[PDB]
DNA sequence: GCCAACGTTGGC
DNA sequence: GCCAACGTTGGC
């Protein structure tokens, strides 16, 4: 489910077609930690909440959006 | 030229 | 001291 890594998965808190993936760092000082990425319906990758907000504009309110989990967490 | 994966760091 | 957010870069 939602806490699987290495798996592209729907993010139901975002508009239709958005997906999320958690990538485990393979090497270096933070090996084993993770980065979370989002993918637009067109497949473009997004790496931060401000980046999502710039792109989505007023079609979403990301104020309570938790980037790491992909859930709204007021 | 693109882009995933690394490391950096300002703001907290 | 941590980490959200991003810049850089080698490998392609």
How do the domains of chain A map onto residue ranges? 1-74
Surface-to-core class of residue A64, CB atoms within 10 Å of its CB (0-12 exposed, 13-18 middle, 19+ buried) = exposed
Rounded Cα distance between A34 and A62, Å, is 22
- Å separating the CA of residue A18 from the C1' of nucleotide C3: 25
Rounded Cα distance between A38 and A33, Å, is 17
- Å separating the CA of residue A45 from the C1' of nucleotide B2: 13
Q: Specify the nucleotide whose C1' lies closest to residue A31 (CA).
A: B6
Resolution (A): 1.6
Question: What tokens appear for A72 in the block?
Answer: 């709204």
Determine contact, residues A31/A25, Cβ cutoff 8 Å: yes
Q: Is the CB of A29 under 7 A from strand B?
A: yes
Experimental technique of record? X-ray
């Amino acid at each position: 489910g939602a806490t699987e890594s290495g798996k592209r998965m729907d993010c139901p808190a975002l508009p239709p077609g958005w997906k999320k993936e958690e990538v485990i760092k393979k090497s270096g000082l933070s090996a084993g930690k993770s980065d979370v990425y989002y993918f637009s319906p067109s497949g473009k990758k997004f790496r931060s909440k401000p980046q999502l907000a710039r792109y989505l504009g007023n079609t979403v309110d990301l104020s309570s959006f938790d980037f790491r989990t992909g859930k709204m967490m007021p």
